[PDB]
């Protein structure tokens, strides 16, 4: 996270850390949507161009963390993966379209003050909240700038950008399955997501029921915090159908 600030203890209880077993290392961010399901970006688990193709046993999931490195005994929970689910039409070849994946935990995790599931968006939430100009929140333990490591979970709120702008800001092709956020040149304010933050949640608080909804997943970008540039996120609602399908099918 660039131009963000230290998160408060438990202000993002659904934040998940995707961890590589050997060698040990932080791979990506992710989120808890149930006591047994974790949501993340597909490119975090599968990206052939770099030979990326992690499987159930190559990873671990660390929930309820705050510190970037400190072992928070009996607070954070380390869970094993029972099965990985990658969207069948995930396009890693051209633009990471439908960059979304699910991971079922071997054993359900117990909720606490530091571990609690976020809400998925539904039609009403999506139609009213996903609007250019509105701010959302991104969090993670990613770099503090382009290739740099926070000692604690970082947080940054970012305004959603009108689709046209998102397009005319990159030569890569945008889908309806993605959206972009970030500040524009003029409005003297900075901030963006960066490597390590991928797979993480973009959330928004409902002004009606006061709950938090993960409207997006940190998907990709071209560098970090650079004028005329914006971060792109997987459009969660647009792919909720697939989500519901996998959860219901494998329960």
């Amino acid at each position: 996270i660039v131009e963000g600030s230290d998160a408060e203890i438990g202000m993002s209880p659904w934040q998940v850390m995707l961890f590589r077993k050997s060698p040990q290392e932080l791979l990506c961010g992710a989120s808890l949507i149930s006591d047994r399901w974790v949501l993340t970006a597909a490119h975090c688990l599968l990206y052939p161009p770099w030979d990326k193709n992690f499987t159930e046993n190559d990873l671990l999931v660390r929930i309820g963390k705050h510190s970037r490195t400190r072992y928070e005994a009996n607070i954070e929970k380390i869970s094993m993966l029972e099965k990985i689910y990658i969207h069948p039409r995930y396009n890693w070849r051209e633009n990471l379209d439908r960059d979304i994946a699910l991971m079922k935990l071997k054993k359900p995790v117990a909720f606490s003050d530091y571990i609690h599931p976020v809400c998925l968006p539904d039609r009403e939430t999506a139609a009213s909240l996903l609007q250019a100009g509105y701010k959302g929140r991104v969090t993670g333990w990613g770099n503090l700038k382009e290739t740099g490591q926070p000692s604690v979970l970082q947080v940054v709120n970012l305004p959603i950008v009108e689709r046209p702008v998102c397009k005319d800001s990159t030569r890569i092709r945008i889908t309806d399955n993605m959206f972009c956020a970030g500040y524009k040149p003029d409005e003297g304010k900075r901030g963006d997501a960066c490597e390590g933050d991928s797979g993480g949640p973009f959330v928004m608080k409902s002004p009606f029921n006061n709950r938090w909804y993960q409207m997006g997943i940190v998907s990709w970008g071209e560098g970090c915090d650079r004028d005329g540039k914006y971060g792109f996120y997987t459009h969660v609602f647009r792919l909720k159908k697939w989500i519901q399908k996998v959860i219901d099918q494998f329960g």
């Binding site: 408060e8 100009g133 509105y134 701010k135 959302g136």
Partner: protein, 32 residues
């Protein structure tokens, strides 16, 4: 439909707001 999802134990549950929470709240007006 949504049970407990989205309500933080150390915040919403305790009627406590986090530091930047209303920046988002205010962005719905699109300014002030």
């Amino acid at each position: 439909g949504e049970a407990d999802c989205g309500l933080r134990p150390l915040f919403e549950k305790k009627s406590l707001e986090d530091k930047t929470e209303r920046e988002l709240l205010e962005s719905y007006i699109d300014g002030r």
